[PDB]
Symmetry: C2
Subunit: 270 residues, 2 copies
């Protein structure tokens, strides 16, 4: 009958677009959504599940991020009615997620295949697993090309932090390309480069991550890695419905990201 | 003790930033928030108020938009416990809102004071009161300068729609400036202009609306109208607390917007 959803009302890209996929897939299978937004607290996560079990909910999707320690918090051990996690901790937990490492490899290998060696990284905030996995993908793509990691500076997902980080990198312009760990930070990188009089991609190539709707309209249109958030929520409903009507715990589904090539990359200049 | 909030989990700018102001003001006065997100339906709005009256909520803020007909829907007439509306219908309803007309006047008068006559408008979607009020501000600013309305094309708040509209305007380039009714549409306008080989502001001036965090990082940094959404939510709590502890229904508060002048405007070329 009904499906519960717990989420966070944040301005970061992803959650609201996942919810569109949940709305679209649940309505197609005859289900309605029971939305209960929470904060970033484990106690509010648990008692949202209790208050959504109060109404006749046949299954609940968790979009609020937890950890790689969901089981060791009396969150998965206590939750035996059908729950799917939109986070990365599968020791037996049915999850669905985007392959962040693979996405960062796509972005970095795109630049390596163009001839770039000095690919700097504007990495995401340390307390996000997605950020840490994207740095690992960038580092290992470079290592497998025989190259040491160039400069890294950490932002916080905002355009402001991408601008500030790029300005610091430009004190030592030892790079021909910048991989920015999301599209918003990439926007700030582009402003720092343009302020310096540097052309994109003629002087410096730039790649982002997310494929937010605005990224095709940056100057220049941004090559980026698409997270298909709507498909993430649709596969969250599809995975949950096997456990509503009764089936085995499925393998943790991993959505491969896609590189969207636009106008912000080129071979390095001579 | 507790304060309830109803809202919508949409990707449009505003709601999540209002919620930051509600969280900050309620925590300062010792209150906690009870969040219940809904869809864009009057029946879900009413029964969210019923299910939030279930928990010991001392007052509830409504961030989900309603209409200019909130009273004639058994929504204000039925709601006698303390409710504040973040919408525009004050026949006796305590509301708080941003002055959309005044903001559009600021944007258009900025361009008129620079010498522009042919100020085209990329207007917002018709079913948003904010969009209709911004068009009225643009039209009346022009009228009070003695000028007829130039070309108008309607978008849908997306950068894509601003790009498509600007491309259509460029089939008849009878404008020296474009007022885009939000910052995202302005981003698409900038791409359409740059694709045409037109310089901003040397060939065409552009003004947006919202002051989203990204707007300072557009190419060029965008002159825009700031909606102080955090102050909107803080004044929503402050207005609600006069009616929790007992006071008269206050006047409908109107927040004046502020023009943020950056690098996207200049006098028209000769």
């Amino acid at each position: 009958h009904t499906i519960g959803v717990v989420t966070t009302g944040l301005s970061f890209y992803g959650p609201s677009q996942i919810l569109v996929g949940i709305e679209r897939a649940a309505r197609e299978h005859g289900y309605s959504l029971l939305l209960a937004t929470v904060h970033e607290d484990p106690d509010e996560v648990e008692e949202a599940i209790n208050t959504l079990r109060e109404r006749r909910v046949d299954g609940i999707i968790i979009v609020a991020p937890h950890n790689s320690e969901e089981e060791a918090q009396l969150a998965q051990e206590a939750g035996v009615p059908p729950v799917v996690f939109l986070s990365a901790q599968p020791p037996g937990v049915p999850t669905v997620s985007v392959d962040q490492y693979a996405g960062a490899r796509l972005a970095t290998e795109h630049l390596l295949d163009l001839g770039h060696r000095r690919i700097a990284l504007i990495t995401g905030p340390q307390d996000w697993l997605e950020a840490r996995e994207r740095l690992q993908g960038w580092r290992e793509a470079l290592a497998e090309a025989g190259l040491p990691p160039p400069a890294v500076l950490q932002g916080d997902w905002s355009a402001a932090s991408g601008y500030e980080a790029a300005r610091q990198l430009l004190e030592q312009p030892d790079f021909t390309a910048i991989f920015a760990a999301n599209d918003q930070m990439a926007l700030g990188v582009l402003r720092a480069l343009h302020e310096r009089g540097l052309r994109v991609p003629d002087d410096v190539s730039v790649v982002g991550f997310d494929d937010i709707p605005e990224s095709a309209y940056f100057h220049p249109p941004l090559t980026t890695v698409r997270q298909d958030f709507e498909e993430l929520g649709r596969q969250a409903v599809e995975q949950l419905l096997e456990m509503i009507e009764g089936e085995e715990p499925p393998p943790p589904a991993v959505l491969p990201p896609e590189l969207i090539v636009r106008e912000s990359t080129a071979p390095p200049e001579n």
